[PDB]
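Colleagues,

For the teaching module next term, I've prepared a clean inverse folding example: a structure given as tokens, and then the sequence designed for it. I'd like students to try predicting residues themselves before seeing the answer, so please don't circulate the second half yet.
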């Protein structure tokens, strides 16, 4: 079910301590290049589940070439998922297994280590400004982008009529609008990822990248609505579950 409040408080404390290590600017040379020259390997991570289970999950790490977006590395494996899902605490469920996959990549094919990881879930667009993409980035020290498929309603952000009016105004792939918190902060961007998709992605900084670069790279990874590194990790982990079950 739901962890007790004292557990959630401990987790909140750890998130606030680790947030001090988030770097929300560009630290990689390819990031400031108008065409991302020098970017060669983009990672994606996801965890799929089997219905009725809650103990078993499949965690996948893929690495794709850039800009061709072909899969050059895949590790999909079964894991014994502990913690339940609680909004705002996604990392405490998934991130320790994702870190293990990165370490296995380091040990098995270190030349294919990704230069940036696209994470299925938010970064600083988060209840305490420290989502799963930040958490992964800080623990692995890799640049990370948070990509969410629906709006986390925090800091006054709401999926109301005005928000949906703004989504209608997004007309083609690459079009965006900023997610401005009540605090005066830009927490992320709504991105229309494709010409033939109207439901936006919600993109935010995970670690070691600026928001404007994160959005533009995310856009360049979209053959479909979901950025191809996450899409392949999503597709491959679900297939793995089905193949062994
Ligand atoms: Mn996911
Ligand atoms: Mn799903
Ligand atoms: Mn998924």
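(Answer key — instructors only)
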């Amino acid at each position: 079910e739901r962890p007790p409040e004292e557990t959630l408080s401990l987790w909140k404390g750890e998130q606030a301590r680790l947030k001090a290590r988030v770097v929300d600017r560009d630290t990689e040379a390819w990031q400031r290049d108008p065409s991302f020259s020098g970017l060669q390997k983009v990672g994606g991570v996801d965890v799929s589940f089997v219905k009725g289970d809650s103990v078993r999950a499949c965690a996948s790490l893929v690495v794709l070439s850039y800009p061709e977006l072909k899969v050059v590395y895949e590790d999909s494996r079964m894991v014994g998922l502990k913690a339940p899902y609680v909004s705002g605490f996604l990392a405490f469920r998934e991130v320790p297994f994702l870190v293990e996959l990165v370490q296995r990549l380091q040990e098995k094919e270190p030349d294919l280590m990704p230069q940036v990881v696209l994470v299925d879930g938010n970064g600083v667009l988060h209840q305490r400004g420290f989502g799963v993409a930040c958490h992964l980035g800080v623990l692995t020290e890799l640049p990370c982008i948070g990509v969410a498929k629906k709006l986390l309603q925090v800091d006054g952000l709401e999926n109301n009529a005005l928000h949906k009016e703004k989504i209608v105004l997004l007309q083609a792939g690459g079009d965006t609008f900023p997610l401005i918190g009540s605090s005066g902060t830009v927490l992320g961007m709504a991105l229309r990822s494709h010409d033939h998709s109207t439901k936006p992605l919600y993109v935010s900084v995970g670690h070691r990248i600026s928001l404007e670069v994160a959005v533009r790279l995310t856009h360049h990874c979209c053959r479909f609505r979901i950025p191809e590194p996450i899409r392949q990790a999503d597709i491959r982990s679900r297939e793995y579950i089905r193949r062994t079950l």
